[PDB]
């Protein structure tokens, strides 16, 4: 059946170039074109350009034209897209998607290709422990959490007393700060729990070979 | 050039009918316009549900039914199903380019509506030795899953230097969003409180921290 597989996540430094490549399958696919598509949060979605691969004929979207060039191999049944000159901007996910004339649009779409475009250097993360500074008076329970700064690139993998302690855990998306990942996580225990009996947030990093296992303690007595 | 417009957020239940809708700046939607309509499901799963107007995509269910009502695009969703909770895009074509509307989140309500349960953190020690301060403010157990944060430092509006992750679904299906304030050290010790407040379907929670008291 129909399936457009892109090729995987691409990281590239400001100024360079890179072209991925969406294999369509299922189809004949002379018989169809291919249209690009620009997502990022937010921003929501841009259409690029799409090609016909039986002529080669290209159409973009003027605000993309200058910048990227859309191609094609029929003979592989794949379709290419390369951007070039690249900056902060066209960091996104980049899709794919069938044109066919007769559904009048884009039935079908790929699993997009995600773009990173950065000047940064593999850093491991540094982990910081976030206990409570107050206790909680209506507070039965307690929220422990762990802050997972300046690394990249993603991704981390964070656990609690490594894999044992699963409920209750929040660990949330990555953001970008200063041009470094950030995230946290959190896990709430009844009261009783902590700091009678240790917690550890096990955070690792495959990028840059790191794993740092930090203890939650509680801040010094008040 | 042209600007596509729908709803931003709707909530429905399961068995209900949703109509969700599209409009053209230029003037009424026409079968010229070639509109279509797609999902996003998470991870970035995107699913073309109709196209031009009303011509039903392979192996999608006939409860979605796109059409045109009098000067828009519009697609209906008879008998909601809980899996149908995710963004809806429609795109219009205008002669040779396809332009997209800013996206519907439907929320299709499989359990009662919850409020964000808020927690901010201060910055640790081990941070501010670095002379760096991040406030972190985790949002969970939220439902409709849409949040807007607004930080306060000593009652004042802060923009600069706030992050905030888009919401994601929890394995309760409820969600989840964290934000971020980041400060220098000295910033920090400026200033005596700091706030996170969260609004969901139009009422806020707020929490507080001064770092003088545990007030």
């Known amino acids: 059946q129909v399936q457009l597989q892109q090729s995987a996540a691409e990281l590239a430094r400001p100024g360079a170039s890179v072209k991925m490549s969406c294999k369509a399958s299922?189809?004949?696919?002379?018989?169809?074109?291919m249209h690009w598509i620009k997502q990022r949060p937010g921003q929501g979605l841009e259409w690029i350009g799409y090609?016909?691969?039986?002529?080669?004929?290209?159409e973009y979207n003027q605000k993309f034209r200058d910048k990227t060039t859309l191609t094609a191999d029929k003979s592989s049944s794949t379709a290419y897209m390369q951007l070039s000159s690249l900056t902060s901007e066209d960091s996104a996910v980049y899709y794919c998607?069938?044109?066919?004339?007769?559904?009048?649009?884009?039935?079908?779409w790929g699993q997009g290709t995600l773009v990173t475009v950065s000047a940064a250097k593999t850093t491991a993360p540094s982990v910081y422990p976030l206990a409570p500074v107050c206790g909680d008076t209506t507070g039965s329970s307690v929220t422990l959490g762990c802050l997972v700064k300046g690394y990249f690139p993603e991704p981390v993998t964070l656990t609690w007393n490594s894999g044992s302690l699963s409920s209750g855990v929040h660990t949330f998306p990555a953001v970008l700060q200063s041009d470094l990942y950030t995230l946290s996580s959190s896990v709430t225990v009844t009261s009783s729990t902590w700091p009678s009996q240790s917690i550890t947030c096990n955070v690792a990093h495959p990028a840059s070979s790191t794993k740092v296992d930090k203890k939650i303690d509680p801040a010094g007595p008040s | 050039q042209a600007v596509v417009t729908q709803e931003s957020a709707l909530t429905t239940s399961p068995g209900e009918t949703v109509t969700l809708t599209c409009r053209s700046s230029?003037?009424?939607?026409?079968?010229?316009?070639?509109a279509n309509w797609v999902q996003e499901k998470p991870d970035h799963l995107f699913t073309g549900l109709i196209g031009?107007?009303?011509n039903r995509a392979p192996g999608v269910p006939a409860r979605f039914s796109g059409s045109l009502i009098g000067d828009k695009a519009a697609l209906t969703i008879t008998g909601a199903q809980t899996e149908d909770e995710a963004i809806y895009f429609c795109?219009?074509?205008?002669?040779?380019?396809?332009?997209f509307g800013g996206g519907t989140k439907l929320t299709v309500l499989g359990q009662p509506k919850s409020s964000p349960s808020v927690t901010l953190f201060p910055p640790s020690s081990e941070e501010l030795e670095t002379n760096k301060a991040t406030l972190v403010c985790t949002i969970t157990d939220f439902y409709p899953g849409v949040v807007t944060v607004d930080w306060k430092v000593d009652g004042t509006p802060v923009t600069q230097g706030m992050e905030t992750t888009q919401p994601s679904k929890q394995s309760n299906n409820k969600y989840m969003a964290s934000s971020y304030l980041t400060l220098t050290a000295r910033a920090w010790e400026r200033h005596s409180s700091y706030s996170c407040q969260v609004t969901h379907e139009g009422h806020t929670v707020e929490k507080s921290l001064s770092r003088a008291d545990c007030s």
């Open positions: 998607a069938r044109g066919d004339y007769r559904y009048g649009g884009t039935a079908y």
């Open positions: 299922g189809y004949t696919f002379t018989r169809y074109t």
């Open positions: 090609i016909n691969p039986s002529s080669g004929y290209t």
């Open positions: 230029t003037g009424a939607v026409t079968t010229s316009n070639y």
């Open positions: 031009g107007t009303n």
């Open positions: 795109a219009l074509w205008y002669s040779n380019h396809w332009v």
